[PDB]
Design a protein around this motif. Structure first.
Motif, PDB file in Angstrom:
ATOM      1  N   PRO A  81       0.814  -1.219   0.000  1.00  0.00           N
ATOM      2  CA  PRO A  81       0.000   0.000   0.000  1.00  0.00           C
ATOM      3  C   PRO A  81       0.854   1.280   0.000  1.00  0.00           C
ATOM      4  CG  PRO A  81      -0.141  -1.144   2.123  1.00  0.00           C
ATOM      5  CD  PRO A  81       0.619  -2.062   1.198  1.00  0.00           C
ATOM      6  N   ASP A  82       2.113   1.155   0.403  1.00  0.00           N
ATOM      7  CA  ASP A  82       3.012   2.295   0.432  1.00  0.00           C
ATOM      8  C   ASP A  82       3.820   2.423  -0.851  1.00  0.00           C
ATOM      9  OD1 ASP A  82       2.378   3.367   2.906  1.00  0.00           O
ATOM     10  OD2 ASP A  82       3.701   1.905   3.895  1.00  0.00           O
ATOM     11  N   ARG A  83       3.531   1.550  -1.817  1.00  0.00           N
ATOM     12  CA  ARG A  83       4.304   1.561  -3.085  1.00  0.00           C
ATOM     13  C   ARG A  83       3.395   1.456  -4.296  1.00  0.00           C
ATOM     14  NH1 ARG A  83       8.784  -2.724  -2.855  1.00  0.00           N
ATOM     15  NH2 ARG A  83       9.873  -1.610  -4.533  1.00  0.00           N
ATOM     16  N   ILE A  84       2.445   2.361  -4.379  1.00  0.00           N
ATOM     17  CA  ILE A  84       1.587   2.526  -5.533  1.00  0.00           C
ATOM     18  C   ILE A  84       1.914   3.841  -6.213  1.00  0.00           C
ATOM     19  CG2 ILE A  84      -0.769   2.638  -6.446  1.00  0.00           C
ATOM     20  CD1 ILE A  84      -1.608   1.020  -3.919  1.00  0.00           C
ATOM     21  N   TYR A  85       2.316   3.726  -7.477  1.00  0.00           N
ATOM     22  CA  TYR A  85       2.877   4.845  -8.256  1.00  0.00           C
ATOM     23  C   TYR A  85       2.024   5.113  -9.482  1.00  0.00           C
ATOM     24  CZ  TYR A  85       6.813   3.469  -5.386  1.00  0.00           C
ATOM     25  OH  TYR A  85       7.615   3.108  -4.339  1.00  0.00           O
ATOM     26  N   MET A  86       2.163   6.305 -10.074  1.00  0.00           N
ATOM     27  CA  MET A  86       1.463   6.586 -11.306  1.00  0.00           C
ATOM     28  C   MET A  86       2.318   7.449 -12.209  1.00  0.00           C
ATOM     29  SD  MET A  86      -2.467   7.788 -11.770  1.00  0.00           S
ATOM     30  CE  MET A  86      -2.319   9.054 -10.534  1.00  0.00           C
ATOM     31  N   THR A  87       2.367   7.094 -13.487  1.00  0.00           N
ATOM     32  CA  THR A  87       3.040   7.856 -14.504  1.00  0.00           C
ATOM     33  C   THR A  87       2.155   7.867 -15.740  1.00  0.00           C
ATOM     34  OG1 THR A  87       5.104   8.071 -15.723  1.00  0.00           O
ATOM     35  CG2 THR A  87       4.254   5.845 -15.491  1.00  0.00           C
ATOM     36  N   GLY A  88       2.399   8.779 -16.656  1.00  0.00           N
ATOM     37  CA  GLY A  88       1.638   8.781 -17.901  1.00  0.00           C
ATOM     38  C   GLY A  88       2.157   9.859 -18.811  1.00  0.00           C
ATOM     39  N   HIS A  89       1.865   9.706 -20.082  1.00  0.00           N
ATOM     40  CA  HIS A  89       2.406  10.571 -21.111  1.00  0.00           C
ATOM     41  C   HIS A  89       1.281  11.319 -21.750  1.00  0.00           C
ATOM     42  CE1 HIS A  89       4.363  11.854 -24.819  1.00  0.00           C
ATOM     43  NE2 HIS A  89       3.709  10.958 -25.537  1.00  0.00           N
ATOM     44  N   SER A  90       1.477  12.625 -21.931  1.00  0.00           N
ATOM     45  CA  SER A  90       0.577  13.447 -22.741  1.00  0.00           C
ATOM     46  C   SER A  90      -0.787  13.552 -22.013  1.00  0.00           C
ATOM     47  CB  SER A  90       0.470  12.812 -24.140  1.00  0.00           C
ATOM     48  OG  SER A  90      -0.296  13.661 -25.019  1.00  0.00           O
ATOM     49  N   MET A  91      -1.860  13.065 -22.621  1.00  0.00           N
ATOM     50  CA  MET A  91      -3.116  12.982 -21.888  1.00  0.00           C
ATOM     51  C   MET A  91      -2.942  12.268 -20.552  1.00  0.00           C
ATOM     52  SD  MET A  91      -6.632  11.191 -23.213  1.00  0.00           S
ATOM     53  CE  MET A  91      -6.488   9.531 -22.548  1.00  0.00           C
ATOM     54  N   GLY A  92      -2.071  11.265 -20.568  1.00  0.00           N
ATOM     55  CA  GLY A  92      -1.763  10.492 -19.332  1.00  0.00           C
ATOM     56  C   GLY A  92      -0.968  11.291 -18.318  1.00  0.00           C
ATOM     57  N   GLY A  93      -0.242  12.320 -18.774  1.00  0.00           N
ATOM     58  CA  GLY A  93       0.487  13.184 -17.844  1.00  0.00           C
ATOM     59  C   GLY A  93      -0.508  14.086 -17.130  1.00  0.00           C
ATOM     60  N   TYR A  94      -1.472  14.604 -17.906  1.00  0.00           N
ATOM     61  CA  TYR A  94      -2.594  15.323 -17.288  1.00  0.00           C
ATOM     62  C   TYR A  94      -3.348  14.439 -16.314  1.00  0.00           C
ATOM     63  CZ  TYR A  94      -2.335  19.572 -20.183  1.00  0.00           C
ATOM     64  OH  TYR A  94      -1.897  20.717 -20.767  1.00  0.00           O
ATOM     65  N   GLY A  95      -3.583  13.195 -16.709  1.00  0.00           N
ATOM     66  CA  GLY A  95      -4.286  12.274 -15.839  1.00  0.00           C
ATOM     67  C   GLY A  95      -3.545  11.951 -14.570  1.00  0.00           C
ATOM     68  N   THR A  96      -2.227  11.787 -14.679  1.00  0.00           N
ATOM     69  CA  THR A  96      -1.426  11.516 -13.475  1.00  0.00           C
ATOM     70  C   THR A  96      -1.650  12.597 -12.418  1.00  0.00           C
ATOM     71  OG1 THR A  96       0.299  10.272 -14.647  1.00  0.00           O
ATOM     72  CG2 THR A  96       0.963  11.251 -12.597  1.00  0.00           C
ATOM     73  N   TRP A  97      -1.543  13.849 -12.827  1.00  0.00           N
ATOM     74  CA  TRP A  97      -1.778  14.918 -11.854  1.00  0.00           C
ATOM     75  C   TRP A  97      -3.226  15.009 -11.400  1.00  0.00           C
ATOM     76  CZ3 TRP A  97       2.244  18.192 -14.835  1.00  0.00           C
ATOM     77  CH2 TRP A  97       3.378  18.455 -14.001  1.00  0.00           C
ATOM     78  N   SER A  98      -4.165  14.965 -12.335  1.00  0.00           N
ATOM     79  CA  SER A  98      -5.563  15.207 -11.910  1.00  0.00           C
ATOM     80  C   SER A  98      -6.097  14.095 -11.027  1.00  0.00           C
ATOM     81  CB  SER A  98      -6.476  15.472 -13.096  1.00  0.00           C
ATOM     82  OG  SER A  98      -6.543  14.371 -13.941  1.00  0.00           O
TER      83      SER A  98
END
Lengths: 193, 191
Positions: A81-98
């Motif tokens: 539970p302490d090691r869940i990450y998110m990355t993404g490119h382009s639309m996915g970069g917007y998605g990572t933050w939002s």
């Protein structure tokens, strides 16, 4: 629908880290397998021992889709539970933050690539270490869309590393920095201050 | 929120056509005014007599937003209901198709640029004349994303024109085809 990568080293006996990888506007749940230097992302996941989930693509119902993918994976696999990450490119970069701004307590660290967002939401996620990647010659998403987010992050004491790639365009920067993204996730676990 | 262009020939005595123009991922309600060859879209709109509304960014209640932009403009301005059009670039190209699929009886014609969508939704809008534009060297949205939609449109007997620009990239094709987009709207009305 989503795609899943499970390292050869996973046997259900030990909790593993999880990366959620969000595709671009043209892509789908296969994009990180089939494109981005022909599946380079999954070489890192196998080498370093991450389960990867790639949802089909991030606001409203799309966001809830992502969170539902996370919850299903956490049911099916032993996820730390302490090691869940998110990355993404382009639309996915917007998605990572939002997505992270809406669910600030879930993710250990983030890596948006060639994205952007609402700089006023950076205070919400100041406890989440972020690696931000953008090319300074991106014609699809202006580099100023990452710069303003990094600037705001710093105004709230975020741990943030920003890789701005001179001459980088919209697409070149993504597979180029997979190593940096996994390095960032290897070195950060979730803070619950 | 949205931003409106109203031609200097509009005097409120005569219904005008309306174009909804949808920006890309990085953009906002100012994009078609300040970018795309420094607002070249609005020079076309002035010369040809179109009110233009540019919503601020397209799924879910981000979609209901467009009918709401159209509705607010129709409150304020005399719009010909048979001449309501939509175009958009990149993310806005996707939006042009997804929003029309959800509201298939509203728009007179569509013009998605460097976009894509769900080819299965094309049956919903086969009665709507469509101009599709895409560059064949686009690295953000593969040119195949338009080509599959055009193929699907033809299955369902759609009136469709496709302009594929040799060497075209993700961005250039938008301002370069504003003349074409306006010509398409000039020549089609809702039946």
């Amino acid at each position: 629908p989503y795609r899943l990568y499970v390292p050869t080293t996973y046997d259900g006996t030990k909790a593993f880290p999880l990366v959620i990888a969000l595709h671009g506007m043209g892509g789908d749940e296969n994009s990180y397998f089939d494109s981005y230097q022909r599946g380079a992302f999954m070489i890192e996941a196998e080498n370093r021992g991450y389960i990867v989930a790639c949802p089909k693509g991030y606001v409203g119902p799309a966001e809830r889709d992502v969170m539902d993918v996370i919850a299903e994976v956490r049911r099916d696999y032993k996820i730390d539970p302490d090691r869940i990450y998110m990355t993404g490119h382009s639309m996915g970069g917007y998605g990572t933050w939002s997505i992270a701004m809406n669910h600030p307590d879930v993710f250990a660290a983030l890596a948006p690539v060639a994205g952007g967002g609402n700089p006023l939401g950076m205070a919400n996620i100041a406890h989440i270490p972020q690696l931000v990647v953008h090319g300074d010659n991106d014609k699809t998403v202006p580099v100023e869309r990452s710069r303003v987010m990094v600037e705001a992050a710093k105004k709230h004491g975020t741990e943030i590393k920003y890789i701005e790639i001179p001459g980088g365009d919209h697409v070149s920067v993504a597979a180029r920095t997979f190593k940096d993204v996994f390095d960032w996730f290897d070195s950060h676990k979730r803070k619950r201050p």
